[PDB]
């Protein structure tokens, strides 16, 4: 098997920049004088995407911004000049020896200015009250970077281990992110109690910001 | 133009056995190679099959052999992939893909995801999230679909009939200790609408046949 180790494994640039995502295979991808290197470009939800063939040929429909190049166990993947669109996995593919492999992959952020999140927050709904559990939402809605803080605070007690945080991909349009923090508390806890609040630092807020509720 | 429609997946016993399909259209599909590749959730592309123009020739990894069969019928231009005893590891997203002359993949199916396990399918509740009269970040109004307690994946949020793109975010589902999944969906709005429009957000799970249409409203 041909192993395939891509470098580096996350890359972080601004747009307009000039990114360079590296492959180096274990053995040879040379023969009957050609490199059987591909590369693909998978986002969210999506397949690969065929960028480059054969090594250097570019996939027609793909952006000029977009070549590649090396032979033998060297390769070089291009980006000349980023777009927020361009954020996705990048894979190198060998397709000469017996077992077809692809690199681990490569993760491309666009690096984005500083945005803040906007919060919002929301009580758990009618319905579910009727059900014996309670559900608190806190939303981080487009911000930048990514690393964000969010306590809960139920009367100014400090939650702990009982909260799940689920972040969606970068945007491809403006490069932001979101943010959704879910605090799970029995029907009973809920209503035995009044005010809910959720607390987010982020580099884009000067100061820590508090979004919260009193029951009913 | 050159498409390729995977059907087929969904959950499955370990164990168990399931066929994966592939109906090409728009391109000669005798003349070509096909591919099978699956990516586990979270990690990378693995090759899992490959099968000549006509048939005659088939190559599978060791992890694969003697388990899984790939074939093809041209007078149907499908491609298919028999499974069988399937385990944990197996559950991924399986793509199908055409093989060009020049050695490179250009033509893939949106993919299929298999999850293979025992736990048995849930259908999703949907509760509202309603933007609430203090929130006010000025002209813009965030609401909401929350579906929790579902199996497996995954689930498709959407708001208005598909009509409501802009703006709306359904984040990744995240895994409960309970054993079943939950996501949220919201999409921020002008304020001056809120009462003004109706908003609608349309669930859909089709491991469980449930079609749910949430109205939300502050």
């Known amino acids: 098997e041909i192993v395939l180790t891509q470098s580096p494994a996350t890359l972080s640039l601004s747009p307009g920049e000039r990114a360079t995502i590296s492959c180096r295979a274990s053995?040879?991808?040379?023969?009957?004088?050609?490199?059987?290197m591909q590369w693909y470009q998978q986002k969210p939800g999506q397949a690969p995407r065929l960028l480059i063939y054969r090594a250097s040929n570019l996939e027609p429909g793909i952006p000029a911004r977009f070549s590649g190049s090396g032979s033998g166990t060297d390769f070089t993947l291009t980006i000349s000049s980023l777009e927020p669109e361009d954020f996705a996995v990048y894979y190198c593919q060998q397709s000469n020896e017996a077992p077809f492999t692809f690199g681990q992959g490569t993760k491309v952020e666009i690096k984005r200015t500083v945005a803040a999140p906007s919060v919002f927050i929301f009580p758990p709904s009618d319905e579910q009250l009727k059900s014996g559990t309670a559900s608190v939402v806190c939303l981080l809605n487009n911000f930048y970077p990514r690393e964000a803080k969010v306590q809960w605070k139920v009367d100014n007690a400090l939650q702990s281990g009982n909260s799940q945080e689920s972040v969606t991909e970068q945007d491809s349009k403006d490069s932001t992110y979101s943010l959704s923090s879910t605090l799970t508390l029995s029907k009973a806890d809920y209503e035995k109690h009044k005010v809910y609040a959720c607390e987010v630092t982020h580099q884009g807020l000067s100061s820590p910001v508090t979004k919260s509720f009193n029951r009913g | 133009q050159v498409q390729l429609q995977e059907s087929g997946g969904g959950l499955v016993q370990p164990g168990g056995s399931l066929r994966l399909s592939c109906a090409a259209s728009?391109?000669?599909?005798?003349?070509?190679?096909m591919y099978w590749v699956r990516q586990a959730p979270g990690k990378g592309l693995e090759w899992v099959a490959t099968?000549?123009?006509?048939?005659?020739?088939?190559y599978y990894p060791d992890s694969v052999k003697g388990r899984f069969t790939i074939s093809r019928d041209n007078s149907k231009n499908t491609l298919y992939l028999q499974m069988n005893s399937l385990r944990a590891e197996d559950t991924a997203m399986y793509y199908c893909?055409?093989?060009?002359?020049?050695?490179?993949?250009?033509?893939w199916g949106q993919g299929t995801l298999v999850t293979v396990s025992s736990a048995s399918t849930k259908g999703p509740s949907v509760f509202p999230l309603a933007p609430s009269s203090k929130s006010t970040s000025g002209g813009t109004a965030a609401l909401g679909c929350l579906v929790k307690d579902y199996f497996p994946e995954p689930v498709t949020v959407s708001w208005n009939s598909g009509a409501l793109t802009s703006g709306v975010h359904t984040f990744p589902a995240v895994l409960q200790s309970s054993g079943l999944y939950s996501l949220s969906s919201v999409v921020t709005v002008p304020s001056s609408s809120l009462g003004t429009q109706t908003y609608i957000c349309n669930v859909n799970h089709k491991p469980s046949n449930t079609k749910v249409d949430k109205k939300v409203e502050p």
């Open positions: 099968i000549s123009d006509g048939g005659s020739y088939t």
């Open positions: 893909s055409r093989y060009r002359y020049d050695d490179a993949m250009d033509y």
């Open positions: 728009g391109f000669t599909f005798s003349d070509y190679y």
């Open positions: 053995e040879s991808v040379d023969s009957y004088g050609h490199s059987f």
